[PDB]
Ligand binder design. Structure first.
Ligand SMILES: O=c1ccn([C@@H]2O[C@H](CO)[C@@H](O)[C@H]2OP(=O)(O)O)c(=O)[nH]1
Length: 204
C-alpha cells in the first residue's frame, strides 16, 4: 500500500440519475429503493489528487462477498445501461478505488455498506422535514445542516439538472478516515458549483 490521506464516501440519489437527459436502466433486480445508494468509497489525497488502479492484477472475486451481493444489489446498484446485476460496477470501483484503500476486498465493501447505514441520509433529512417531492422546494442550507446534525460532519452536495431544468441533489460526499474507522471532517471538498440556494429532492 502507498497510503493516502482520507476517503471520500460518495452516495447518490437514484432518482436524480434517472430523471435527466441521459439513459438510466434499472438493475436486474428491478427498480431500486427510494433511498440513497452507494456510488463508491474513494481513497484520496489532501492535495486534491488521488491514487487509482493500484493493483491492475487484482480482479473482483465475488465469492468473497457472496453473502453481501443481495444487499449490494439494493444499496449499491448500477443505474447504467443496459440493465445489469451491478457486478461490473462493483468490479470497476474495486479495481479503481478498492485496490488503493489498503482494505481487503470484503472489508472494502462492508465498510461502504456500514457507512451508508451510519450516515442514514434519508432519515436524517426526514427528521428535518425534508422529503422527496418535485420542484426546487428545499434550501441547500437546510439539507446540508440536516445531514450535518445526523452525521456530526458537514457533507458536500453535488447537484445536476433534470429534464425540466430543475437543479436537484445528485450526490452527497462525506469523508472517512484512512483506517475506515469513522467519519471525519473533510480536509478538502470537490470544486463543483451546480447547487443553487434552492434545489429539488425528486421522488421515485
Ligand atoms: O475525487 C475524485 C473525483 C472523481 N472521481 C471519479 O470521476 C467522476 C467525476 O464525475 C466520478 O463519477 C468518479 O468516478 P469513478 O471513480 O467512480 O469510477 C474519482 O475517482 N475521485
Amino acid at each position: 500500500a502507498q497510503d493516502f490521506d482520507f476517503f471520500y464516501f460518495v452516495q447518490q440519489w437514484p432518482a436524480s440519475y434517472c430523471d435527466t437527459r441521459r439513459s438510466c436502466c434499472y438493475p436486474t433486480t428491478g427498480k431500486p429503493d427510494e433511498d440513497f445508494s452507494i456510488h463508491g468509497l474513494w481513497p484520496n489525497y489532501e492535495n486534491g489528487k488521488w491514487p487509482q488502479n493500484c493493483d491492475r492484477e487484482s480482479s473482483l472475486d465475488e465469492s468473497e462477498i457472496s453473502d453481501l451481493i443481495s444487499t449490494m444489489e439494493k444499496n449499491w446498484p448500477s443505474l447504467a445501461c443496459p440493465s445489469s446485476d451491478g457486478v461490473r460496477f462493483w468490479s470497476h470501483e474495486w479495481l479503481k478505488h478498492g485496490t488503493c484503500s489498503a482494505l481487503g476486498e470484503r472489508a472494502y465493501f462492508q465498510a461502504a455498506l456500514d457507512f451508508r447505514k451510519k450516515s442514514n441520509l434519508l432519515e436524517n433529512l426526514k427528521n428535518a422535514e425534508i422529503t422527496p417531492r418535485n420542484g426546487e422546494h428545499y434550501t441547500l442550507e437546510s439539507i446540508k445542516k440536516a445531514i450535518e446534525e445526523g452525521v456530526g460532519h458537514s457533507p458536500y452536495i453535488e447537484c445536476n439538472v433534470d429534464t425540466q431544468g430543475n437543479h436537484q441533489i445528485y450526490q452527497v460526499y462525506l469523508c472517512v478516515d484512512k483506517t475506515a474507522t469513522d467519519f471525519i471532517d473533510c480536509p478538502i471538498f470537490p470544486h463543483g458549483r451546480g447547487c443553487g440556494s434552492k434545489i429539488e429532492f425528486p421522488p421515485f
